[PDB]
Amino acid sequence: ITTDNTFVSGNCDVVIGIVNNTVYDPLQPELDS
Amino acid sequence: ITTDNTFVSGNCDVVIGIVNNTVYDPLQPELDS
Ligand SMILES: *[C@@H]1O[C@H](CO)[C@@H](O)[C@H](O)[C@H]1NC(C)=O
Ligand SMILES: *[C@@H]1O[C@H](CO)[C@@H](O)[C@H](O)[C@H]1NC(C)=O
Numbered sequence: 161i162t163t164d165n166t167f168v169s170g171n172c173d174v175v176i177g178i179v180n181n182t183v184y185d186p187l188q189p190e191l192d193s
Numbered sequence: 194i195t196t197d198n199t200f201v202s203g204n205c206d207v208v209i210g211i212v213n214n215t216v217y218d219p220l221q222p223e224l225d226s
Contacts, residue, residue, distance in 0.1 A: 167197065187220065187223055191223055
């Protein structure tokens with residue numbers, strides 16, 4: 161799950177069926193490296 | 194106004210009716226931090 165394929169919206173307390181995970185921004189390896 | 198919803202083309206000098214404001218790149222806070 162990458163933020164050039166997903167987008168940020170809303171909060172996790174309303175939608176039903178949402179699950180715990182981590183979403184890997186492709187900007188993160190660029191900024192960490 | 195996000196660069197994930199707008200794109201990079203042109204300048205202030207061609208298109209009629211442009212108003213002066215700021216554009217919040219969603220990359221900009223990670224660039225700053
Ligand atoms: C319907 O979805 C909820 C939330 O995802 C889940 O807890 C529930 O078990 C589901 N219903 C069935 C019959 O599995
Ligand atoms: C994981 O999802 C649950 C909902 O099942 C939520 O309450 C929790 O805040 C989430 N995050 C965690 C455990 O870091």
